[PDB]
Every structure is written in C-alpha cells, then in structure tokens.
C-alpha cells in the first residue's frame, strides 16, 4: 500500500534537513575557529617582533 | 503479566521512527478494530496487525 | 511483518547515514580551518620579518 513511501520520505526528509543543519553548523564553527587562531597567532608574531 | 505471551520477535524495536504497541479489544469488536486499523490515526503502518492472545 | 517495515528500517539506516555524512564532512573540514589559518599567519610573519630586515 502507498503510505509506506510517504512514511519513509518523511523521515528521509527529516534526515536531509538534519544533515543540512550539521553542514551549516560546521561552516559556522570554522569561521569562529579561524577567528580564534589567526588573530591570536598574528598578535604573538607582533609581540615577538 | 504478558511474560509468557510475548517475545522480542513479536515487535518492531531498536528504531528511531517505528514502534509496535499492544491493544486489547472485545472479541465481538475484532472486525471493528480491523476496519479501523488502516484509519484510526495518521502514520500507522498499513496491513500489519497480529493477534498474540485471546480470552 | 508485511515487508514495508523493512523498507522503513532501511530508511532509518539511510537517515542515520545522511546525518553521519554531515558529521564526517564536519570532522574532515575542521582541519581545513587550521590549514587556511596556517596560510594567513605566515603572511604577517613574512611582513614583520621583511620590516625588521628593513630596520636592520
């Protein structure tokens, strides 16, 4: 019967959206990570010179 | 107690999005519950009943 | 069992796999952030090195 296709597609679409959230949240963390790293290292380089 | 009636193999278990559940129905209303099985709530698994005891 | 249950269990397997791909993409790309930072910080190091050599 047809409804099993919808029931799969529903949980599959939740998985699509959850994966896409984790893929967004990954890039958001990498922009914070570079912000922590590059400025601290630049400041250490400046304090050395 | 259901401990002599049911076993793990009788249920959908260990899942994120499906569950098997137990219902007791009057013997006279067996066919009424069969009419309702496909329809009583949304996102029920179609055509997958199983009687495990009768009294 | 009616077989559609097994297809839904496979849709759970694929659902877990999809979010696991995004976790794996995150775990791999975390080191790209460090490799990109390592490229930038060397530019400031070279600039201050050249400026120091100019003062010398």
UniProtKB/Swiss-Prot annotation, chain A:
Location(s), subcellular: Apical cell membrane; Cytoplasmic vesicle, Secretory vesicle, Synaptic vesicle membrane; Cytoplasmic vesicle, Clathrin-coated vesicle membrane
PTM-bearing positions, type Phosphotyrosine: 48
Expression tissues: Expressed in brain (at protein level).
Domain of life: Eukaryota
Family according to the record: Belongs to the V-ATPase E subunit family.
Purpose: Subunit of the V1 complex of vacuolar(H+)-ATPase (V-ATPase), a multisubunit enzyme composed of a peripheral complex (V1) that hydrolyzes ATP and a membrane integral complex (V0) that translocates protons. V-ATPase is responsible for acidifying and maintaining the pH of intracellular compartments and in some cell types, is targeted to the plasma membrane, where it is responsible for acidifying the extracellular environment.
Subunit and interaction comment: V-ATPase is a heteromultimeric enzyme made up of two complexes: the ATP-hydrolytic V1 complex and the proton translocation V0 complex. The V1 complex consists of three catalytic AB heterodimers that form a heterohexamer, three peripheral stalks each consisting of EG heterodimers, one central rotor including subunits D and F, and the regulatory subunits C and H. The proton translocation complex V0 consists of the proton transport subunit a, a ring of proteolipid subunits c9c'', rotary subunit d, subunits e and f, and the accessory subunits ATP6AP1/Ac45 and ATP6AP2/PRR.
Protein name: V-type proton ATPase subunit E 1
Upper taxonomic lineage: Eukaryota, Metazoa, Chordata, Craniata, Vertebrata
Gene that this sequence comes from: Atp6v1e1
Residues shown, of full length: 9 to 57 of 226
From Swiss-Prot, chain B:
Subcellular localization: Cytoplasmic vesicle, Secretory vesicle, Synaptic vesicle membrane; Cytoplasmic vesicle, Clathrin-coated vesicle membrane
Signal peptide: none
Tissue: Expressed in brain (at protein level).
Domain of life according to the entry: Eukaryota
Quaternary assembly: V-ATPase is a heteromultimeric enzyme made up of two complexes: the ATP-hydrolytic V1 complex and the proton translocation V0 complex. The V1 complex consists of three catalytic AB heterodimers that form a heterohexamer, three peripheral stalks each consisting of EG heterodimers, one central rotor including subunits D and F, and the regulatory subunits C and H. The proton translocation complex V0 consists of the proton transport subunit a, a ring of proteolipid subunits c9c'', rotary subunit d, subunits e and f, and the accessory subunits ATP6AP1/Ac45 and ATP6AP2/PRR.
Role noted for this protein: Subunit of the V1 complex of vacuolar(H+)-ATPase (V-ATPase), a multisubunit enzyme composed of a peripheral complex (V1) that hydrolyzes ATP and a membrane integral complex (V0) that translocates protons. V-ATPase is responsible for acidifying and maintaining the pH of intracellular compartments and in some cell types, is targeted to the plasma membrane, where it is responsible for acidifying the extracellular environment. Subunit C is necessary for the assembly of the catalytic sector of the enzyme and is likely to have a specific function in its catalytic activity.
Entry's family note: Belongs to the V-ATPase C subunit family.
Protein name: V-type proton ATPase subunit C 1
Species whose genome carries this gene: Rattus norvegicus
Organism taxonomic ancestry: Eukaryota, Metazoa, Chordata, Craniata, Vertebrata
